[PDB]
Structures are given as structure tokens and as C-alpha cells.
Write an enzyme that holds these catalytic residues in place. Structure first.
Site, PDB file in Angstrom:
ATOM      1  NE  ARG A   8      -1.523   1.554   3.624  1.00 21.89           N
ATOM      2  CZ  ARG A   8      -0.934   2.695   3.971  1.00 21.89           C
ATOM      3  NH1 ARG A   8      -1.285   3.836   3.393  1.00 21.89           N
ATOM      4  NH2 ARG A   8       0.012   2.703   4.898  1.00 21.89           N
ATOM      5  CB  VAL A   9       1.699   3.840  -2.223  1.00 30.65           C
ATOM      6  CB  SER A  10      -0.759   7.657   1.256  1.00 31.04           C
ATOM      7  OG  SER A  10      -1.210   7.134   2.494  1.00 31.04           O
ATOM      8  CB  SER A  11       0.286  10.045  -2.945  1.00 28.61           C
ATOM      9  OG  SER A  11       1.613   9.632  -2.659  1.00 28.61           O
ATOM     10  CD  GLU A 107       1.647   6.534   4.204  1.00 32.31           C
ATOM     11  OE1 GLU A 107       1.295   5.668   5.036  1.00 32.31           O
ATOM     12  OE2 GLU A 107       2.232   6.260   3.127  1.00 32.31           O
TER      13      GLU A 107
END
Lengths: 144, 147
Positions: A8-11, A107
Site C-alpha cells: 500500500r501507498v497513500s498517493s 504520510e
């Protein structure tokens, strides 16, 4: 030991760093001797409990198909309530293997705001003046 | 049919409000005809994932003894990750019955107490668990709340 990769990555900009994460765990597993059953990913915040990939992971685990879940850091699986996910998985006899972030600060700050904004709404009003006061102030305070 | 009551208050001073909680749900249940199997309580924050009562509730549900969990507000079960608890319970065929909705009225004191702890933990994660800048943000936010 049948394994499922969660990354998972936020952006959207961080799309390149997510492929590197999948790759770390993919080579990590195939060196360990795990057969990678599936690879599930998400471009969303750890705060979102309704991630499409996470909910596919929940169903995979529940289907007793997989034996272990691989993530780089706990932060990747969920921002809050890791212990509940750990409990859901363990009842299906699935272990969470945490391979290791000192990297993510942007983050942590971005997730802090979104929490403050929601809570400010709950405390003062979702469309109130005092809510705007706290969120504009906190944003200015982190600047320093 | 077989029901387990979960009640929670953040502070020791709120001990009277926890007994009111247990009571709303105990009667709710006898009116529902549900047999109350057990009543589990906790005097701790919704942010603590390791509440003695919560973990006894988890073991009860996992033992397939109970059929439904009664709480006044979602807030009582956990501050964050209700959806994960909901999923853990549902796999054991246990439903969570939430008696109330958008009713929180006094909750503002629990929300601000939880918000300070969140900002304190995050400040440690961002600047350092024993850093100067962490103290700067937490002293500032506390001062900003007053106003």
C-alpha cells in the site's frame, strides 16, 4: 507456506514505490520458500478500512486459501486497529509476517490532519467556524 | 437470542454513566426477549485495542457461545477500526446491534481527550517520542483547543 502479498501507498505519485514494495516481498517470499498465491495492492490511506484490496485480502484469508500475509511495515496494513486484523486472521490460522518506516513523515502528517479535520467536525461541527480555526492552526503549527 | 453486553467509559469519574449504559442494554434485551449471557465492561479509552473486557468479548464470540453483541454507540466498542471488529464477529456469525445513531451529546470531552493522545503519539512518530518539536506541537494544540 502459501503467502499473500499486501502492499500500500497513500498517493498516486508514489505508484513507483508500491511496485518496489511488491517486488521486495515477492523476492523475500521466493527466497524464504513461500509460494506467492496472490498480490493485493491499494493506492489509499491506512485510515480507510474499506480499501478494495484489503477487503479482497479479508475474503482470501477467510476462505482458508492462504497460510501467511506479507507486508513491509505494520503501517502498510492499517494506520489503526492492526490488533483487530491480527485477531481476524489468526482465527483463520493465518500469520502476519512484518519484514521490517523512517521514510514516511509526509504520510504521518497528512494522516494527522485528516484525523484532526474529522474529530474537529465531531467536536465543533462538520461545517462550523471553530473546526476551521483548529485545522488552519494545526497546519500552520506543523510548518514552524 | 443469546446476547453479550459491551459497555465502556473512558474515566473513573464516569463510573455512574457505565452502569446507566449496562442498564439501557439489559432492559433493551429483556424487551427483545434476548437472554443476556454475560455483561463485559471497561474503564478505558476506545483507542486501547488491548482492553481486558474487549479481549474477553473477542474470546466469547470466537467460542461461538453468544449470537449478538449489544452496545449503545459504535464509539463504545472502539474509537477506530470498528469495521475490522465487525468482520471478526461476523465470521463467527455474531451480529453487533447498535441501539443509537447520531445521538452523542456530551461526547465532546471524550473526543478531545482522544484527540490529544492521537496528536501526542503522532508528534512522537513525526518528530521523536522524546523530542523538543513534539512538545511544541502538543503544547500548542492544547492551547488552541481552549479557544
Amino acid at each position: 507456506i502459501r503467502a499473500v502479498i499486501y502492499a500500500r501507498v497513500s498517493s498516486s505519485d508514489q505508484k513507483e514505490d508500491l511496485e518496489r514494495q511488491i517486488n521486495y516481498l515477492t523476492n523475500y517470499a521466493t527466497a524464504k520458500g513461500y509460494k506467492v498465491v496472490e498480490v493485493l495492492k491499494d493506492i489509499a490511506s491506512g485510515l480507510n478500512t474499506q480499501r478494495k484490496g484489503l477487503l479482497k485480502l479479508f475474503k482470501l484469508v477467510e476462505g482458508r486459501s492462504v497460510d501467511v500475509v506479507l507486508i513491509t511495515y505494520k503501517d502498510r496494513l492499517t494506520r489503526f486497529g492492526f490488533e483487530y486484523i491480527e485477531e481476524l486472521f489468526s482465527t483463520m490460522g493465518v500469520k502476519i509476517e512484518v519484514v521490517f518506516p523512517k521514510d514516511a513523515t509526509q504520510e504521518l502528517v497528512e494522516d494527522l490532519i485528516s484525523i484532526i479535520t474529522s474529530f474537529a467536525g465531531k467536536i465543533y461541527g462538520m461545517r462550523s467556524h471553530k473546526k476551521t480555526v483548529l485545522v488552519q492552526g494545526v497546519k500552520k503549527l506543523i510548518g514552524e
